[PDB]
Amino acid sequence: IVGGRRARPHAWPFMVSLQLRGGHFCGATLIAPNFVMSAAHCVANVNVRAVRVVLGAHNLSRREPTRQVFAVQRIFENGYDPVNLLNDIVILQLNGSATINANVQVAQLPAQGRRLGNGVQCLAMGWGLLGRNRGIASVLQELNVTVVTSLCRRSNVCTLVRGRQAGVCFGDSGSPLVCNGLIHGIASFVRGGCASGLYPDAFAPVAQFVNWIDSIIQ
Ligand SMILES: COC(=O)C1=C(C)N(c2cccc(C(F)(F)F)c2)c2n[nH]c(=O)n2[C@@H]1c1ccc(C#N)cc1CC[N+](C)(C)C
Ligand SMILES: *[C@@H]1O[C@H](CO[C@@H]2O[C@@H](C)[C@@H](O)[C@@H](O)[C@@H]2O)[C@@H](O)[C@H](O)[C@H]1NC(C)=O
Ligand SMILES: *[C@@H]1O[C@H](CO)[C@@H](O)[C@H](O)[C@H]1NC(C)=O
């Protein structure tokens, strides 16, 4: 996240860090005790047997006793199309069930088909690149963004910060976009580099996939 701020510790207890040997590579969202959802582009070229699903985290540089770590048992996809950048969603079934508590909670999802209007205020978040060549964040970042339909396809939810350069970046892939208390997006792609101040950030539109999500988480 470029131009955001540190989240309050454990403000977003559905927020997940996907990790490989020495560290974070993508975000995800806890959507049931034994399932997370992320971006398909996060895992397309990675050995899922090596992925660690880290719940309850805040500062990735510290040992945090709040964390719970799972492996991935199974992946469910929904027509990921990397050429057209469509259907950028994956569900990862965990090898066990999270212990739900103050620091680890299941996200709330929208109803199937619910679109967001121009001007909806959301929060993006993640442990991705901070901009100004600062690398991956240690402390979870959040960012106020606004939904836009301009320079966006109907197959995405897009967002833009106005009046300054700010937005999601590498390593924010797969992270939730929270709008009116519900997870409406999964970070998918940027144009113009991160935080261009021109192109909106694009998210997989969670509302388009809710019946599919529900069918899996049961
Ligand atoms: C494997 O791909 C990737 O890791 C791509 C990534 C990481 N990012 C990207 C960059 C900054 C922030 C974010 C974030 F928004 F998710 F946080 C994502 C990206 N931006 N643009 C782009 O093409 N990509 C990548 C990409 C992202 C999403 C989809 C989908 N659907 C497909 C591709 C590949 C597209 N082709 C290059 C094959 C045309
Ligand atoms: C910045 O964002 C703050 C948090 O946003 C609200 O809560 C999150 C979880 C989402 O549900 C989001 O849709 C909500 O708007 C707001 O408290 C604050 O007012 C925002 N400030 C501005 C100027 O956008
Ligand atoms: C799931 O995987 C984690 C991480 O490897 C491990 O610590 C845990 O024991 C596993 N749980 C079950 C129920 O197999």
Side-chain angles (χ1 to χ4, degrees), residues 52 69-71 95-96:
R52 291 185 175 101
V69 181
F70 291 89
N95 71 319

Side-chain angles (χ1 to χ4, degrees), residues 173-196:
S173 293
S175 303
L177 178 73
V178 187
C179 309
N180 303 132
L182 306 177
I183 311 302
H184 270 100
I186 299 165
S188 183
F189 65 92
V190 304
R191 291 162 288 165
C194 306
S196 65

Side-chain angles (χ1 to χ4, degrees), residues 82-124:
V83 175
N84 296 304
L85 297 83
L86 296 174
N87 302 323
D88 193 11
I89 186 167
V90 64
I91 290 170
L92 310 175
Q93 183 168 356
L94 310 181
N95 71 319
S97 290
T99 293
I100 300 304
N101 61 27
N103 297 326
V104 177
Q105 295 191 36
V106 175
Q108 298 178 53
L109 305 186
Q112 173 72 42
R114 178 67 77 79
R115 288 190 179 280
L116 298 178
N118 260 130
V120 170
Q121 301 297 313
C122 307
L123 212 56

Side-chain angles (χ1 to χ4, degrees), residues 56-72:
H58 184 236
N59 185 338
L60 297 188
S61 75
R62 291 187 190 293
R63 282 180 181 281
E64 294 181 312
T66 59
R67 290 177 187 175
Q68 297 177 42
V69 181
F70 291 89
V72 177

